[PDB]
Amino acid sequence: MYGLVNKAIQDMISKHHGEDTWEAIKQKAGLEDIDFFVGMEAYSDDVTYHLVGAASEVLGKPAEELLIAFGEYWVTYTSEEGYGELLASAGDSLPEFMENLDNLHARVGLSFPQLRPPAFECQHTSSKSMELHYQSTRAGLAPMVLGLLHGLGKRFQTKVEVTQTAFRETGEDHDIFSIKYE
Ligand SMILES: O=C(O)CCCCN(CCc1cc(F)ccc1OCc1ccc(-c2ccc(C(F)(F)F)cc2)cc1)Cc1ccc(C(=O)O)cc1
């Protein structure tokens, strides 16, 4: 994925656990070569997973867990580090922002074509409930979506309960989440 995701992981770990740890996780992930990640450069999705795997061991936490944390962090990180207005242009509420993703990503891919964006459909069951379909060319990032949602919940001071009712990794076509929100 574009370096942007890898810098984010690095920024989070470093900020929460110091460079010593980050350097460690980097060496273990077998990436002690890469002196630094380039934001607008396309890397092999495997580069990210390796960082997730190494961070899992080095921190004694499970991948799925860190992915949740990274989900939340991403929403904050992007607004700060050069993507505030892009995010601001996505809406003034969770439900709206989620409908804008497909648009938002298209909007982004234009600048960066090697972008392989996921699809996000939404059936608004009610005015406080919606069903989210997450479709991706990657595997094992459902947990990050979980974090992403909560991050959006904080961004719009909205209480939100997210629970996953279908999992790709277990055969099912694609991940599906059920969402309740204040
Ligand atoms: O793999 C999957 O299925 C998706 C895994 C989850 C990661 N995606 C989160 C989507 C999301 C969900 C959400 F709920 C809130 C916010 C969200 O993001 C807002 C946002 C998304 C992207 C940029 C941005 C900014 C700059 C750049 C570039 F560097 F210039 F290229 C590139 C992307 C900014 C803000 C983003 C994503 C998607 C594809 C690629 C790639 O294909 O590499 C990289 C990252």
Short mmCIF file of C-alpha atoms and ligand atoms in Angstrom, two decimals:
data_model
loop_
_atom_site.label_atom_id
_atom_site.label_comp_id
_atom_site.label_asym_id
_atom_site.label_seq_id
_atom_site.Cartn_x
_atom_site.Cartn_y
_atom_site.Cartn_z
CA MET A 1 0.00 0.00 0.00
CA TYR A 2 1.15 3.59 -0.47
CA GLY A 3 3.88 4.38 2.06
CA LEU A 4 1.30 6.54 3.79
CA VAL A 5 -0.04 3.51 5.63
CA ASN A 6 3.44 2.34 6.63
CA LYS A 7 4.50 5.76 7.92
CA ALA A 8 1.30 5.76 9.99
CA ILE A 9 2.07 2.39 11.57
CA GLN A 10 5.59 3.65 12.31
CA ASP A 11 4.31 6.91 13.73
CA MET A 12 1.86 5.11 16.04
CA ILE A 13 4.32 2.54 17.40
CA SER A 14 7.03 5.17 17.86
CA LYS A 15 4.66 7.60 19.55
CA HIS A 16 3.22 4.93 21.86
CA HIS A 17 6.34 2.80 22.50
CA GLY A 18 9.45 4.81 21.55
CA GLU A 19 11.94 4.47 18.69
CA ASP A 20 13.91 1.71 20.39
CA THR A 21 10.82 -0.49 20.10
CA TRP A 22 9.99 0.78 16.61
CA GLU A 23 13.54 0.07 15.45
CA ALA A 24 13.23 -3.38 17.01
CA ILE A 25 9.94 -4.17 15.26
CA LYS A 26 11.50 -2.88 12.04
CA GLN A 27 14.54 -5.19 12.28
CA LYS A 28 12.36 -8.18 13.17
CA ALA A 29 9.96 -7.39 10.33
CA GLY A 30 13.12 -7.81 8.25
CA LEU A 31 12.94 -4.25 6.97
CA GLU A 32 16.06 -2.82 8.61
CA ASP A 33 17.12 -1.90 5.08
CA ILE A 34 14.38 0.67 4.36
CA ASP A 35 15.87 3.77 5.97
CA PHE A 36 12.49 5.52 5.83
CA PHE A 37 9.09 5.07 4.15
CA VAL A 38 7.98 7.37 1.34
CA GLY A 39 4.39 8.58 1.67
CA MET A 40 3.43 8.70 -2.01
CA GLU A 41 5.21 5.53 -3.11
CA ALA A 42 3.48 2.17 -3.70
CA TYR A 43 4.81 -0.73 -1.63
CA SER A 44 3.93 -4.43 -1.56
CA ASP A 45 0.95 -5.05 0.71
CA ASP A 46 3.24 -7.60 2.39
CA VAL A 47 5.41 -4.79 3.73
CA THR A 48 2.51 -3.74 5.94
CA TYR A 49 1.59 -7.23 7.13
CA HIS A 50 5.19 -7.85 8.15
CA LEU A 51 5.05 -4.73 10.31
CA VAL A 52 1.78 -5.96 11.81
CA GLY A 53 3.27 -9.41 12.44
CA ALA A 54 6.47 -8.08 14.01
CA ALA A 55 4.59 -5.56 16.14
CA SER A 56 2.45 -8.45 17.36
CA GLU A 57 5.46 -10.38 18.67
CA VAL A 58 7.52 -7.46 19.93
CA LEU A 59 4.56 -6.08 21.90
CA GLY A 60 2.95 -9.37 22.92
CA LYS A 61 -0.37 -8.23 21.46
CA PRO A 62 -2.36 -9.88 18.72
CA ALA A 63 -2.38 -8.54 15.17
CA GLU A 64 -6.15 -8.09 15.20
CA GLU A 65 -5.73 -5.92 18.29
CA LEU A 66 -3.09 -3.54 16.92
CA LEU A 67 -5.12 -3.31 13.70
CA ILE A 68 -8.05 -1.96 15.70
CA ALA A 69 -5.81 0.61 17.34
CA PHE A 70 -4.30 1.51 13.98
CA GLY A 71 -7.80 1.93 12.57
CA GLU A 72 -8.57 4.70 15.07
CA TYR A 73 -5.14 6.27 14.77
CA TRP A 74 -5.44 6.52 10.99
CA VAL A 75 -8.42 8.89 11.18
CA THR A 76 -6.47 11.24 13.45
CA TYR A 77 -3.11 10.81 11.76
CA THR A 78 -4.43 11.67 8.30
CA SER A 79 -6.21 14.85 9.42
CA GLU A 80 -3.03 16.11 11.08
CA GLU A 81 -0.35 15.01 8.60
CA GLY A 82 -1.65 16.69 5.42
CA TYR A 83 -5.19 15.42 4.86
CA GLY A 84 -7.53 17.48 7.04
CA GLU A 85 -9.66 19.15 4.37
CA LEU A 86 -9.91 15.94 2.35
CA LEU A 87 -11.45 14.29 5.41
CA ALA A 88 -13.51 17.38 6.21
CA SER A 89 -14.96 17.20 2.70
CA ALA A 90 -16.27 13.70 3.44
CA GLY A 91 -19.11 14.84 5.70
CA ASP A 92 -20.39 16.09 9.06
CA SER A 93 -21.53 12.70 10.39
CA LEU A 94 -20.65 9.01 10.49
CA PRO A 95 -23.41 7.80 8.16
CA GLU A 96 -22.65 10.56 5.64
CA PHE A 97 -18.88 10.08 5.81
CA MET A 98 -19.32 6.37 5.11
CA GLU A 99 -21.40 7.06 1.99
CA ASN A 100 -18.59 9.34 0.81
CA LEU A 101 -15.76 6.81 1.08
CA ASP A 102 -16.27 5.37 -2.41
CA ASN A 103 -16.40 8.97 -3.67
CA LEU A 104 -13.52 10.02 -1.42
CA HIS A 105 -11.24 7.22 -2.63
CA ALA A 106 -12.07 7.82 -6.29
CA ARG A 107 -11.22 11.43 -5.53
CA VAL A 108 -7.85 10.22 -4.23
CA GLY A 109 -7.01 7.50 -6.76
CA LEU A 110 -6.99 10.18 -9.46
CA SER A 111 -3.79 11.59 -7.97
CA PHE A 112 -2.40 8.14 -7.16
CA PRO A 113 -3.49 5.44 -9.66
CA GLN A 114 -1.78 2.46 -8.03
CA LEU A 115 -4.41 2.84 -5.31
CA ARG A 116 -6.49 -0.29 -4.71
CA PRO A 117 -9.41 1.13 -2.70
CA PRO A 118 -12.02 -1.00 -0.91
CA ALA A 119 -15.76 -0.71 -1.53
CA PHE A 120 -18.13 0.41 1.23
CA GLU A 121 -21.87 -0.12 0.73
CA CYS A 122 -24.44 0.97 3.31
CA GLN A 123 -28.01 -0.15 3.86
CA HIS A 124 -29.41 2.29 6.42
CA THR A 125 -31.74 -0.07 8.29
CA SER A 126 -32.92 2.91 10.38
CA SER A 127 -31.87 6.36 11.63
CA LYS A 128 -29.47 4.91 14.21
CA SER A 129 -28.70 1.61 12.50
CA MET A 130 -26.95 0.69 9.25
CA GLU A 131 -25.36 -2.39 7.70
CA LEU A 132 -21.86 -1.93 6.28
CA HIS A 133 -20.46 -4.07 3.47
CA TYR A 134 -16.67 -3.97 3.32
CA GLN A 135 -15.05 -5.22 0.12
CA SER A 136 -11.28 -5.17 -0.33
CA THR A 137 -8.47 -6.55 -2.46
CA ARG A 138 -6.64 -7.22 0.81
CA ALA A 139 -7.22 -9.80 3.53
CA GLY A 140 -7.34 -9.50 7.32
CA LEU A 141 -8.05 -5.79 7.73
CA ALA A 142 -11.59 -6.10 9.05
CA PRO A 143 -10.26 -5.25 12.53
CA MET A 144 -8.77 -2.04 11.15
CA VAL A 145 -12.19 -1.08 9.78
CA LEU A 146 -13.50 -1.65 13.31
CA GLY A 147 -10.95 0.87 14.57
CA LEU A 148 -11.63 3.22 11.68
CA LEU A 149 -15.31 3.36 12.63
CA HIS A 150 -14.65 4.17 16.29
CA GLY A 151 -12.15 6.80 15.15
CA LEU A 152 -14.95 8.35 13.09
CA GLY A 153 -17.15 8.12 16.18
CA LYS A 154 -14.68 10.26 18.11
CA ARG A 155 -14.33 12.67 15.20
CA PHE A 156 -18.09 13.32 15.30
CA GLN A 157 -18.55 12.91 19.05
CA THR A 158 -20.94 10.04 18.28
CA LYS A 159 -21.34 6.90 20.41
CA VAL A 160 -21.19 3.86 18.12
CA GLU A 161 -21.44 0.09 18.61
CA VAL A 162 -19.81 -1.98 15.86
CA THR A 163 -20.22 -5.75 15.57
CA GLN A 164 -19.25 -7.95 12.62
CA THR A 165 -21.87 -10.39 11.32
CA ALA A 166 -19.89 -11.93 8.44
CA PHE A 167 -16.20 -12.68 7.84
CA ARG A 168 -14.39 -13.00 4.52
CA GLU A 169 -11.43 -14.89 5.94
CA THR A 170 -13.81 -17.75 6.78
CA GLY A 171 -15.17 -18.28 3.26
CA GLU A 172 -18.01 -15.75 3.13
CA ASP A 173 -17.92 -13.45 0.11
CA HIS A 174 -17.10 -10.30 2.08
CA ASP A 175 -17.09 -8.75 5.55
CA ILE A 176 -20.35 -7.31 6.85
CA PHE A 177 -20.80 -5.16 9.95
CA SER A 178 -23.92 -4.11 11.86
CA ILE A 179 -23.71 -0.59 13.29
CA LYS A 180 -25.63 1.30 15.98
CA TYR A 181 -24.87 4.96 16.78
CA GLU A 182 -25.96 7.86 19.00
O1 LIG B 1 -6.99 -2.36 1.77
C1 LIG B 1 -8.13 -2.00 2.13
O2 LIG B 1 -9.14 -2.69 1.89
C2 LIG B 1 -8.28 -0.67 2.84
C3 LIG B 1 -7.52 -0.68 4.16
C4 LIG B 1 -7.83 0.56 4.99
C5 LIG B 1 -7.05 1.78 4.52
N1 LIG B 1 -7.98 2.72 3.88
C6 LIG B 1 -8.85 3.28 4.92
C7 LIG B 1 -10.15 3.80 4.33
C8 LIG B 1 -10.87 4.64 5.35
C9 LIG B 1 -11.97 4.13 6.04
C10 LIG B 1 -12.61 4.91 7.00
F1 LIG B 1 -13.68 4.44 7.66
C11 LIG B 1 -12.17 6.20 7.26
C12 LIG B 1 -11.08 6.72 6.56
C13 LIG B 1 -10.44 5.93 5.61
O3 LIG B 1 -9.37 6.45 4.94
C14 LIG B 1 -9.39 7.81 4.51
C15 LIG B 1 -8.18 8.04 3.64
C16 LIG B 1 -7.80 7.03 2.77
C17 LIG B 1 -6.66 7.19 1.99
C18 LIG B 1 -5.91 8.36 2.08
C19 LIG B 1 -4.78 8.49 1.29
C20 LIG B 1 -4.01 9.65 1.32
C21 LIG B 1 -2.87 9.75 0.51
C22 LIG B 1 -2.52 8.69 -0.33
C23 LIG B 1 -1.29 8.78 -1.18
F2 LIG B 1 -0.23 8.47 -0.46
F3 LIG B 1 -1.17 10.01 -1.65
F4 LIG B 1 -1.41 7.92 -2.19
C24 LIG B 1 -3.29 7.54 -0.36
C25 LIG B 1 -4.43 7.44 0.44
C26 LIG B 1 -6.30 9.36 2.96
C27 LIG B 1 -7.43 9.20 3.75
C28 LIG B 1 -7.24 3.79 3.19
C29 LIG B 1 -6.36 3.25 2.09
C30 LIG B 1 -6.91 2.58 1.01
C31 LIG B 1 -6.09 2.08 0.00
C32 LIG B 1 -4.72 2.28 0.05
C33 LIG B 1 -3.83 1.69 -1.02
O4 LIG B 1 -4.36 1.05 -1.96
O5 LIG B 1 -2.59 1.75 -0.89
C34 LIG B 1 -4.17 2.95 1.13
C35 LIG B 1 -4.98 3.44 2.14
#
